[PDB]
């Protein structure tokens, strides 16, 4: 159920390896990524963190799990604010 | 194997008409290839964003007919004959503008009429632009080229009306430079109570993306309301205020509006060949009528006020 992704957080300078869980919601995924960015290189801010496939327009629902998303291990995601 | 076949007198799709095809038939019929393949309207990935848009908002519309292509514009207008017709009507309107300006018509209107015009007439450019944008949407989504062509000409007619309104707002400002003419229309459209029913109606109508709902709300609800509650009441008020140009201008605009009503009714008649469509069209009319009624009531109470 360990599931590696590569994640780019909004306003950060890089993409990082973040190992999430197959059964994680997108809300949970966003939080696991934010851990490695917010208050490290990215200023905290108000708003709702959302997950999308890298460079996509369409956002994954907040409640959707990694398993439900159709994402493959080691694919790239962005975490952005809506 | 393959056959040896002789030439046809017209397009293969018209070759079994009994009548000689008209110019209208030759240049207007069965041109949307995007309806040929239900799974891929456009020649792209079947689930490309625009393919999904068309599968949802055209193909899946509850308004259904097995032969939308057989729809015929009652006026059988093509680009060429539209321009002949409209150059006639528009040269007539431009000649009225010239002549009435020569006679200094705007100076002879009843005291205060410029303020009524600033408030109830000049912001119509926003309303007419909304009709223009909406007509273009029905164009791009309609399931037959003969339907789309009617929408194309209707989109042009909406811009015609917008342009008359722009020209006359400017012209009136020249006689009456202290009325806000050409300066305050956005503020009125956004903030004035008499415009808010109309603004709410159009913002919501422009977000009705199903082709059938777009068509019915625009052409069967919104546009006839404009005729009975905006155009005709303005003609009456103009008569009471010794504005003799506005009634003539509106009469020309009403010719366009009647044409839009004619083709739209013809489309309904075509659609009702499918009995299921009656409840569908009725449902949307009943959905949108209250909003249109509120819009008309708010406008009329503004036109009536001091």
């Amino acid at each position: 159920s360990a599931f590696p992704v590569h994640a780019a957080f909004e306003k950060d300078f890089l993409v990082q390896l973040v190992v999430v869980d197959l059964n994680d919601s997108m809300d949970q995924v966003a939080e696991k990524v934010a851990y490695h960015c917010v208050n490290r290189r990215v200023a905290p801010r108000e708003g709702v963190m959302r997950v999308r496939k890298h460079r996509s327009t369409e956002l994954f629902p907040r409640d959707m799990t990694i398993a439900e998303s159709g994402l493959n291990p080691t694919e790239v995601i962005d975490v952005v604010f809506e | 194997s393959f056959e040896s076949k002789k030439p046809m007198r017209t397009w293969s799709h018209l070759a079994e008409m009994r009548k000689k095809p008209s110019e209208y038939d030759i240049v207007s019929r069965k041109l949307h290839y995007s309806t040929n393949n239900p799974d891929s309207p456009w020649e792209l990935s079947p689930d490309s964003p625009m393919n999904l848009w068309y599968k949802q908002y055209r193909n899946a519309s509850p308004l259904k007919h097995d032969n939308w292509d057989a729809f015929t514009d009652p006026d059988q207008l093509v680009y060429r004959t539209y321009n002949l017709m409209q150059d006639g009507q528009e040269s007539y309107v431009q000649s009225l503008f010239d002549q009435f300006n020569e006679r200094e018509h705007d100076q002879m209107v009843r005291e205060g009429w410029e303020h009524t015009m600033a408030r109830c007439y000049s912001p119509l450019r926003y309303l007419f632009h909304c009709l223009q944008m909406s007509s273009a949407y029905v164009q791009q989504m309609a399931p037959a080229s003969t339907i789309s062509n009617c929408c194309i000409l209707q989109t042009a007619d909406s811009l015609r009306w917008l342009t008359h309104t722009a020209y006359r707002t400017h012209e009136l400002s020249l006689t009456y430079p202290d009325a806000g003419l050409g300066e305050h229309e956005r503020e009125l459209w956004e903030k004035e109570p008499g415009w808010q029913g109309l603004r709410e109606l159009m913002e919501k109508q422009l977000t009705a993306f199903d082709w059938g709902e777009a068509f019915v709300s625009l052409n069967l609800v919104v546009k006839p309301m404009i005729v009975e509650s905006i155009f005709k009441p303005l003609q009456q008020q103009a008569w009471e205020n010794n504005d003799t140009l506005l009634p003539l201008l509106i009469d020309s605009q009403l010719k366009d509006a009647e044409r839009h009503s004619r083709w739209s009714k013809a489309l309904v008649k075509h659609a009702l060949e499918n009995p299921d469509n009656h409840a569908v069209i009725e449902g949307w009319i009943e959905k949108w009528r209250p909003l249109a009624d509120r819009a008309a009531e708010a406008y009329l109470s503004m036109l009536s006020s001091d």
Partner: protein, 498 residues
């Protein structure tokens, strides 16, 4: 008196307002509008440089059509059909088939802008653009219609876009990608800027030059009149482009222009290239395809792109090499597989034509000339089975056109392949592969004609099965050599014993 347009024009485009009953994003959804997050207020500075207004439009367009139709009427008895070189007649057939219903599709690109662009001047100019493309579709159906009674291949002026014929698939994949399948700002950049100030000048003016030389004034007059509208509505692109650059979207703008220009190039190399350098009779070739490319695309179009602040496309040098090579091979492919076309390709390889080709493309005879040598020998020796194909060409998963290269003495061919989501795709250039990778969701489940043949979508699996799948209804409709091989009579005869 009348007041001049300059005094009331601004009111005609004072049409933006701040939405209150729905959100800005609901009214202008990104997937349809393509505003890239640029707010409404910023779009109000959009200023179309080539303006018109409703009264002028109806008056002037009335005059444009009066001339086009009058010239047609006056020349009905000029015997263009019966007296023209058949290569010229095939040029008409390929033009009307490839273009007429696509022009009508362009109405939808203009309509997309008229509803969904955040720039008010763009919405109005796009309304005239809708009207213009309606004109172009109607003209380009009306004109060939009179030839239906003479030749079933003219039915394709209407039929092509309703078919799965390979060249029709190529046309639709291009037009559906750049015109009808993307958001309003993409259309503004890709169609009006990239396509309508670029490649349409080749088919509608370059070709008009050849038409005039060929004495076909009905056609020359028609297509040049059409281009006068294009020259106006195409000027919607520049201001969109300048706005995107001003608002931090240069990179996005450049990518879209780069993509659209390449996509247009490959289609025009298959349509216009063989027309200009092979189907048009030698005496009527005003300039070569490459000379016209240097005039219209390099000298005019690309110079305009630089003036507006964009860069030369990354693939510049590949493009220049392609201009020297690609259409010669596409011509070869279309001619060898002529039975799959709705027009009759002229081979265009008589000695005098080969001398011209050598002058215009030094080295031609040691390259394409090698293949035409084998073909010519076969024709002269009546070995006709060897001049017709018994398999399919491999086809690009972007352009939908055969995968080609340079034949003969310095043979070079390259296919650019890609695995994506557990499927293997093949492209005719680095640039085509790059286009796919820019937007895979647009393309990923599309199947080209070869993919369909291999998947069992084309039944039966024979030349005949494919031809029927492609919409052919009779022997008469399928392409033949334009001159029924009478061109071999100008080649040195193949001697036999006496």
């Amino acid at each position: 008196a009348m007041h001049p347009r300059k005094d009331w024009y601004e009111l005609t485009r004072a049409t933006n307002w701040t939405p209150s009953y729905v959100t800005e994003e609901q009214l202008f959804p990104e997937r349809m509008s393509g505003h890239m997050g640029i707010p409404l207020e910023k779009w109000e500075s959009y200023d179309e440089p080539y303006k018109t207004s409703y009264p002028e439009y109806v008056s002037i367009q009335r005059e444009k059509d009066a001339g086009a139709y009058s010239v047609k009427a006056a020349l009905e008895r000029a015997k263009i059909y019966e007296n023209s070189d058949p290569g010229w007649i095939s040029t008409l057939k390929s033009h009307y088939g490839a273009i007429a219903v696509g022009e009508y599709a362009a109405v939808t690109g203009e309509g997309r802008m008229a509803r969904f662009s955040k720039a008010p001047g763009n919405r109005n100019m796009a309304t005239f653009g809708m009207m213009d493309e309606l004109r172009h579709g109607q003209l380009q159906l009306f004109f060939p219609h009179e030839y239906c009674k003479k030749d079933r291949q003219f039915d394709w002026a209407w039929r092509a876009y309703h078919s799965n014929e390979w060249a029709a698939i190529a046309a639709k994949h291009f037009f559906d990608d750049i015109i009808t399948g993307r958001d309003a700002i993409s259309v503004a950049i890709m169609l009006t800027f990239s396509f309508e100030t670029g490649f349409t000048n080749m088919q509608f003016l370059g070709l008009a030059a050849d038409a005039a030389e060929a004495g076909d004034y009905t056609f020359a007059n028609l297509i040049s009149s059409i281009q006068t509208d294009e020259s106006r509505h195409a000027q919607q692109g520049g201001p969109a482009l300048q706005l995107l650059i001003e608002n931090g979207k240069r990179e996005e703008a450049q990518k879209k222009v780069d993509m659209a220009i390449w996509r247009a190039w490959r289609l025009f190399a298959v349509l216009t290239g063989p027309v200009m350098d092979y189907y048009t009779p030698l005496e009527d070739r005003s300039q070569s395809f490459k000379e016209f490319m240097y005039e219209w695309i390099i000298g005019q179009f690309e110079r305009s792109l630089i003036d507006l602040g964009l860069d030369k496309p990354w693939y510049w040098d590949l493009f220049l090499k392609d201009i020297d090579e690609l259409h010669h091979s596409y011509h070869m492919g279309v001619w060898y597989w002529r039975t799959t076309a709705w027009w009759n390709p002229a081979a265009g390889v008589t000695p005098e034509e080969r001398d011209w080709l050598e002058e215009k493309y030094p080295g031609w005879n040691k390259r394409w000339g090698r293949c035409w040598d084998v073909i010519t020998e076969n024709v002269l020796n009546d070995r006709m089975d060897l001049v017709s194909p018994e398999t399919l060409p491999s086809v690009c998963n972007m352009s939908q056109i055969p995968l080609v290269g340079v034949p003969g003495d310095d043979w070079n061919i390259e296919v650019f392949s890609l695995e994506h989501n557990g499927r293997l795709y093949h492209f005719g250039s680095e640039v085509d592969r790059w286009v796919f990778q820019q937007d895979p969701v647009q393309y990923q489940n599309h199947m080209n004609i070869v993919d369909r043949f291999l998947a069992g979508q084309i039944q039966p699996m024979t030349l005949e099965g494919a031809l029927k799948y492609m919409g052919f209804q009779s022997i008469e409709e399928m392409g033949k050599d334009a001159h029924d091989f009478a061109w071999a009579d100008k080649c040195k005869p193949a001697m036999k014993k006496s």
